[PDB]
């Protein structure tokens, strides 16, 4: 499955 | 900005046999940026309904795409692949060779 994106993490 | 020129391979999914259905493949790889235009040609005219794989890339981040269309090759039809990219000063056209 896809890695859970965390709200607030960007580059 | 980094630009990579594409590598073109024109071939059929199965060994081409006259009169039997097959798939005409144009495999463009090793290019950057991802924006690329690829058209399959039959005697010099674009095939109307060509499909392509989903965008992916290799270890060096260079993209690759497979453009394919169902076709039935004959003895006299000449197929080719025309690809245009920012690294190309003019559209590159690679003709399909069966006996390669």
């Amino acid at each position: 499955i896809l890695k859970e994106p965390v709200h607030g993490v960007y580059y | 900005m980094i630009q990579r020129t594409p590598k073109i391979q024109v071939y059929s999914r199965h060994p081409a046999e006259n009169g039997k259905s097959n798939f005409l493949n144009c495999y463009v790889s090793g290019f950057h940026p991802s924006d690329i235009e690829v058209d399959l040609l039959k005697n010099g005219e674009r095939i109307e309904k060509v499909e392509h794989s989903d965008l992916s890339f290799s270890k060096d981040w260079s993209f690759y795409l497979l453009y394919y269309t169902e076709f039935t090759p004959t003895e006299k039809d000449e197929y080719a692949c025309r690809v245009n990219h920012v690294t190309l000063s003019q559209p590159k056209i690679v003709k399909w060779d069966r006996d390669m």
């Binding site: 859970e4 994106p5 965390v6 709200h7 607030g8 993490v9 | -």
Partner: protein
């Protein structure tokens, strides 16, 4: 499921004792847990940020643990002091930080160890600009409750832990006042601790 329970809702502990309270959250759909302390008139202050199961974090007399498998976090306070009186909030980010759920909070009230109580009701001298007479209920046991007033004109405040630092003395107090002429101080706080001194 996005619910954060905080237990107990309210709790009173004597100064010098130790206490703990709990924060409950769903084990799944968990991302992080914060503990905030919110003293009166202050702002919410961060105590701990815990993100791993079995996390044990200590800051002075305040420690905390995190159990993500069971969905529990425990806050411990050793040797409670008057400064510890605050509302402790549990902040549980959920759904990979896409849900920011706050707890109802555990309100901590530190009670003073009032030994040798001397409950009494005194009348304070008036000021030249005030129409009301002021009464003072003071030096009563920490487990005495000052119920409200049954007279509209009579106003009564709640208890008030007064700390005389230099003498190592603490005293509970409550003040009542009214501008009525039929208002005495020995008949203003009408459950008094009994043996209350009425001068």
């Amino acid at each position: 499921i996005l619910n954060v329970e905080q237990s107990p809702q309210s709790l009173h502990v004597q100064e010098g004792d130790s206490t703990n309270f709990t924060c409950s959250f769903p084990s799944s759909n968990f991302y992080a847990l914060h503990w905030y302390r919110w003293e009166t008139a202050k702002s919410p202050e961060a105590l701990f940020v815990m993100t791993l199961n079995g996390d044990e974090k200590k800051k002075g007399r305040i420690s905390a643990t995190l159990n993500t498998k069971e969905g529990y976090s425990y806050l411990y306070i050793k040797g409670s002091q008057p400064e510890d009186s605050a509302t402790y909030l549990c902040y549980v980010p959920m759904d990979s930080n896409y849900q920011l759920i706050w707890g109802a909070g555990t309100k901590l009230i530190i009670k003073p160890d009032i030994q040798n109580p001397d409950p009494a009701v005194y009348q304070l001298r008036d000021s030249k600009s005030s129409d009301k007479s002021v009464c003072l209920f003071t030096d009563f046991d920490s487990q005495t409750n000052v119920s409200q007033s049954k007279d509209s004109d009579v106003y009564i405040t709640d208890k008030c832990v007064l700390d005389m630092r230099s003498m190592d003395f603490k005293s509970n107090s409550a003040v009542a006042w009214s501008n009525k002429s039929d208002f005495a101080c020995a008949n203003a706080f009408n459950i008094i601790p009994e043996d209350t001194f009425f001068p």
